Amino acid sequence: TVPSIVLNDGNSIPQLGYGVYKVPPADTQRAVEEALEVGYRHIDTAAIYGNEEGVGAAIAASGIARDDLFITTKLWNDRHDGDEPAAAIAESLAKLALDQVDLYLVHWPTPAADNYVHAWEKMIELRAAGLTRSIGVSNHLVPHLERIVAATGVVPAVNQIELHPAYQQREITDWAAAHDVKIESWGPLGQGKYDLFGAEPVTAAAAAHGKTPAQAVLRWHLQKGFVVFPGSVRREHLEENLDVFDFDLTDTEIAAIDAMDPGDGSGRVSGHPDEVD
Numbered sequence: 418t419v420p421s422i423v424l425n426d427g428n429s430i431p432q433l434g435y436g437v438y439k440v441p442p443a444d445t446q447r448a449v450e451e452a453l454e455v456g457y458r459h460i461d462t463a464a465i466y467g468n469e470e471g472v473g474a475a476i477a478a479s480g481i482a483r484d485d486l487f488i489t490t491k492l493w494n495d496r497h498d499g500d501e502p503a504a505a506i507a508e509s510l511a512k513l514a515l516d517q518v519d520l521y522l523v524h525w526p527t528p529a530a531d532n533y534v535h536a537w538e539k540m541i542e543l544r545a546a547g548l549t550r551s552i553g554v555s556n557h558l559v560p561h562l563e564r565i566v567a568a569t570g571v572v573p574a575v576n577q578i579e580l581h582p583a584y585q586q587r588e589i590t591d592w593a594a595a596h597d598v599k600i601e602s603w604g605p606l607g608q609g610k611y612d613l614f615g616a617e618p619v620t621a622a623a624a625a626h627g628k629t630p631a632q633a634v635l636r637w638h639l640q641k642g643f644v645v646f647p648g649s650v651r652r653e654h655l656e657e658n659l660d661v662f663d664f665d666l667t668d669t670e671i672a673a674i675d676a677m678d679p680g681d682g683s684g685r686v687s688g689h690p691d692e693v694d
């Protein structure tokens with residue numbers, strides 16, 4: 418059993434899902450079929466991942482009822498302009514072989530291109546047309562968010578950003594809570610870019626519950642109310658990552674993990690929105 422959370426638009430989303438980022442396209446179908454089998458229902462993909470087909474194929478292969486699944490895809494940086502958003506989403510839909518997706522995201526803000534507002538406008542139209550159930554963004558900074566909302570009056574259901582113990586983007590998460598936008602933690606486990614599992618706050622919490630560090634970290638995101646979809650191809654980790662609704666961390670435990678953030682942005686492991694396209 419994976420609990421769901423409710424969006425500002427009333428739609429619900431499973432709090433834990435399976436992200437297929439990094440999964441080679443030729444292997445995505447197996448990977449998803451396995452997650453599916455494991456009990457995963459929320460699939461996180463993206464057009465840029467070039468593996469929507471595999472996901473779609475996996476879905477179809479599973480006997481699974483459409484309504485029981487949560488499918489997320491994202492709008493690539495080069496499709497912000499004109500009616501490209503509608504073209505991009507249609508392509509995605511065709512790959513997934515779905516009528517519509519559950520959630521659709523503006524992959525990156527590409528501020529320098531100053532087309533993220535236009536993208537947002539088009540996104541709204543996509544939802545209106547029923548191409549997607551909900552809409553959100555990704556990698557959007559506070560100013561990005563203010564601007565889109567100001568321009569449209571429509572608030573993203575979510576903001577998918579890089580988030581883990583060493584790099585929390587508190588300003589964003591704070592803004593989100595104030596605006597009722599849910600947070601999707603990408604790279605929830607640091608992408609192996611640093612010794613997260615070695616962190617003492619992490620080991621203390623895991624040990625304190627008879628869980629793994631990965632599990633404890635996952636629990637922290639969850640408890641903080643964020644949405645997670647860690648990547649993994651090992652069934653051992655799949656099952657493991659699913660086994661986190663069984664327990665809960667103490668406030669003290671959470672607080673200790675929260676202290677891991679240097680507060681200077683030095684804990685970042687991936688690309689910054691001001692730098693991507």
Ligand SMILES: NC(=O)c1ccc[n+]([C@@H]2O[C@H](COP(=O)([O-])OP(=O)(O)OC[C@H]3O[C@@H](n4cnc5c(N)ncnc54)[C@H](O)[C@@H]3O)[C@@H](O)[C@H]2O)c1
Binds near residue numbers: 437
């Ligand atoms: N919005 C964006 O720009 C963006 C960027 C990156 C990823 N995403 C999404 O977020 C998902 C998760 O992030 P990620 O995969 O980049 O990094 P991550 O923090 O999930 O780290 C992934 C790595 O952790 C390992 N992992 C998973 N479970 C583990 C466990 N129990 N024990 C040990 N290792 C374990 C995997 O082997 C994998 O190599 C992706 O699948 C993708 O769908 C979105």
